[PDB]
Symmetry: D3
Subunit: 152 residues, 6 copies
Amino acid sequence: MSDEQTFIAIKPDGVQRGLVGPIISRFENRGFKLAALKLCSPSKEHLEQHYADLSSKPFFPGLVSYMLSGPIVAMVWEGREVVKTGRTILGATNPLASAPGTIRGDFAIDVGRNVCHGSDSVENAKKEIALWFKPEELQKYKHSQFDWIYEK
Amino acid sequence: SDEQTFIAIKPDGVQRGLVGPIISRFENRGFKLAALKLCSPSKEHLEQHYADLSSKPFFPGLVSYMLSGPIVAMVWEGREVVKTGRTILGATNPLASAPGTIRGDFAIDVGRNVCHGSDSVENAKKEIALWFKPEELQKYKHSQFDWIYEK
Amino acid sequence: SDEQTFIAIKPDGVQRGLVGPIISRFENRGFKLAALKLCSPSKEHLEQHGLVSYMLSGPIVAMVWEGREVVKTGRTILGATNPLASAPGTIRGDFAIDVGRNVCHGSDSVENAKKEIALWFKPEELQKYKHSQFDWIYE
Amino acid sequence: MSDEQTFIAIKPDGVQRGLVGPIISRFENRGFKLAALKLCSPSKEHLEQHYADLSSKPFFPGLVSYMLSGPIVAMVWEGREVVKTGRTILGATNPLASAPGTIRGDFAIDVGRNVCHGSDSVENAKKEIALWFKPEELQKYKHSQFDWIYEK
Amino acid sequence: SDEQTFIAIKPDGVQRGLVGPIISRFENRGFKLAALKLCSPSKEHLEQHYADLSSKPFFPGLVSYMLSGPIVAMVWEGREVVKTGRTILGATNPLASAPGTIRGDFAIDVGRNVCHGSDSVENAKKEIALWFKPEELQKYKHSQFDWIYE
Amino acid sequence: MSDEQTFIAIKPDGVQRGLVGPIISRFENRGFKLAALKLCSPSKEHLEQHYADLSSKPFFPGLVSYMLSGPIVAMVWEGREVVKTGRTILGATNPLASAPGTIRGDFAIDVGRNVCHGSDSVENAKKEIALWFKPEELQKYKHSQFDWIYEK
């Protein structure tokens, strides 16, 4: 289905290195629809809930602490199989294992500075979308190019 | 420098897939993104925003077109950023705009001029207050501040 | 080599403003533009070649590209027939989502290319010139 | 007024230097509609009639032989004020008088290798379109983004 | 033709990752890259480069900022490249530069204007000899010369 | 470790096809530091010692003579795993085997015209760097965004 959504966050290093526009354009150019966008500085408790599936692991306080270093750009992109295609566009979580042409493959090196966060799954996406955005922040509109992007 | 300006990508800018390129122009120039959101403001909100045009005849047409899709509201910060933003955006009429500005590269009709930008410092302050709660403004130091600015 | 392939930008590619970027990827790689035209083919010019209902919904850009292994490399530049299976960095990997809106078509073989080329172009449309950078592109 | 047309040609130097894609992109990105497109090699008599208003100028014989030195991308672009806007996108006839961000300001040096031709008026544009294209080559269609490009 | 100019990417331009893009603007225009290096000139080298500004009160601050990080020095060759090199860079004060120019695209403060360009054919001759040895100046025919020039 | 180094050279076809800018951009954008850069025209004996392990093999006198046909942009790039990541950025030695998004898969066709040289290992990089560059041409400075690029 074409209304599938996914959560993308530009991490503090993505913002600080000036990669907002480029990252947005990779999703814009692919035909996905921008459903929500905001520059925010989430609470530690917010970030702890975001990564709660990693709360047991040793790098957790450092991950959360890193992610407070400055504002994050939170986005929802909408389209058919966008979560999986989002993951493909971002590249592998480890940038050194990413293909050139992907975001991390073009712009990143270290797993701890991998510029972007993408949902692992439709399941996680709905979870992460709900955490970072109120329903009113999700924009309901039809893509002007819908019928040229999708056949069904 | 701490000067701020208000840039909105209009519904045509969003629907024509220009959010990324518009943001890039400002990032590349050295300006700092202080606030960003995709919103769908109310009719009254856009009438407040365009109050200086309440008496004119295109005001109802303008307000309704601004109602026709999501808008990207942004605050950019830097020295002389409100005058320099107006230069990056180009002349209000895209056919009077130079190539290499946003409207010079992307727009044709003044009623589809893809971006809104504040016309003065004072008006930028009013528009930032109108579109953003103060907690939506982000306070951080740009990683390259001393490479961008001498003072 | 003067091997040729046939690349078409489908009407979704044209209507989505992808003519420029698609041409640049073949240009930057070192292939030679041998033929180019915006056309709206017949429904019969297309059955020797929702699918056909939409192959008529807009103009098509028809192209011949000349260079060594251009038919196999052309498929590589275009990417997998289904965009959701194609890599970022390919045309469909950067720009498309659905197979039925996969932006462009290219020949599947060197002999299908010759046949597709003779079908879309008259021999006078095929240009014969020497790429200005030929000797820097090939040995 | 929304369907004014103009004639843009990529000269043989533009073609040989790999500027076909980038030139077509400036017009595309601005919102103009590609109405006709072809790679062709016009005869000498063609080029002399195309440049008929400068047959008396000293450069005319070199102009024509250069215009014969390789294939040309001929195009028709359609939109409001497209002939005048297209002149501005192209930039001054002499590239050294041309602002960066125009085609000639970004890509050319010599007035005699200025990469592009564009018509100098609406009426002149109609004459050139009729000269280089048959009616059947001009595509008629609505641009998928018409209502976001124009208010009419 | 074959007139030469001196262009330098200042430390801010190098440190903000603008070396690729600046080079592309000259490359795309048709000018020929005659010489190129990333270097760190001495205080004395930089004071001589800016000699005609010993008088002014910003001179010592200028010199030290030009020492704050490596510099990419270049020679570009082509017809009127000195003047055209100046149009490409834009007004020395970026806020006076037009979008489309390097300073109008990338820069804000005149003290952080990412690029130096010779103000003159004569001064370009000086600056080129100052920054490069003869062995570093490459002489070769641009592969596209006849398509770039009449 | 983040001060690893690799040797990358833009071959004469690369320089002559106007790829100096785009190539440097690929590495800049990834977050690697440019440590040395020079346009040079090496001697034949210099180039012979560069390929000394292919002195016998038949490629040599043709490979050497082609590497002499025009000037070369020598570079050193610095970063974590930069020698292996540089090879990934360049693409396969045969451009027809490299994926789009790499340098050779975007710009090249012939293996004897693959626009770019990159060392095959950390050790060969050290050797190749010492061969092409004088120690004082290696610049020692801290990347302005080192802490946003690396978690070290």
